[PDB]
Structure formats: C-alpha cells, structure tokens
Design a protein around this ligand. Structure first.
Ligand SMILES: *C(=O)CCCCCCCCCCCCC
Length: 131
C-alpha cells in the first residue's frame, strides 16, 4: 500500500538473485511472491505477513507442522516464504536450500544462548511401559 517498510527496489534485486535450486540456473521471480501472497489470503493468512520477517515466522510455523500432512501445494509456500525470511533478516543465501538450512542452524544459536532459560522450562515425564 502507501505505507511500506521493507525496501521497494533494493530487496527486489536480491530476491531475483536467489536461485530456485542448489545446482540449477533458475531463480526467484514475482510469480512466486504474488502466487504466495494470494494463496495465503485463502489460508486465512494476510499477504502482508510476508512484509516483515516476524510475520513469516508465524506463517512458516503454521505450515511447518503441516508440511507432512499438506500436499505439494503447502510445500511450495513454505519453501518460498522460508527464503524471503532469510533476506528479511539480512541473510545472504546461495539457493532455496541454503535458505531453509540457514533458518535452522540460525535458531540453533538461540539454544546455545539459552542454557539457563531452557533449564528453567523443562521436566522429565516418565510415560508407561506395560506388556
Ligand atoms: C503497502 O503498504 C504494501 C506493499 C509493499 C509490500 C511488499 C514487501 C513484502 C514483499 C511480499 C512478500 C515477498 C515474498 C518473497
């Protein structure tokens, strides 16, 4: 709309800079965004959530636990939305895969810097074990 806060020109260059495959020659294009923004509108998810890295976290996290149940359609969104996330956090990816992996290894840092926080929230639940 008339109120943006992402880039509008800069990020665009980077977007088309990311490759669709690890060893391919294909790259990302508007077709992917527009398509994603639309689909989201149907999944009760505003297309504006992809505007801020924070928003994506909510989207990806939702389709995350669904990447198994959902069809190939849900897998297409996650892949895309996942990439943009890296760009929004100022992360230079090499390919669609590099993005997904980054989002993972990245979060790993938090765990290392939360040895006290994690210990505070945790318990040992001993389930049953009969014959
Ligand atoms: C009007 O105020 C909003 C128009 C500008 C928003 C575009 C920035 C976010 C790009 C959409 C998601 C990209 C998916 C890779």
């Amino acid at each position: 709309g008339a109120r943006a806060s992402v880039a509008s020109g800069g990020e665009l260059d980077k977007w088309e800079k990311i490759r669709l495959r690890p060893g391919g020659k294909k790259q990302y294009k508007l077709k992917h965004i527009v398509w994603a923004s639309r689909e989201l509108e149907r999944f009760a998810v505003n297309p504006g959530l992809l505007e801020t890295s924070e928003g994506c976290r909510q989207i990806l996290g939702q389709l995350q636990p669904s990447l198994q149940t959902g069809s190939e359609e849900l897998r297409s969104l996650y892949n895309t939305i996942a990439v943009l996330y890296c760009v929004h956090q100022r992360i230079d990816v090499k390919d669609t895969k590099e993005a997904l992996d980054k989002i993972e290894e990245e979060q790993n840092k938090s765990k290392k810097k939360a040895q006290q926080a994690a210990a505070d929230t945790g318990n040992n639940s001993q389930v049953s074990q009969n014959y």
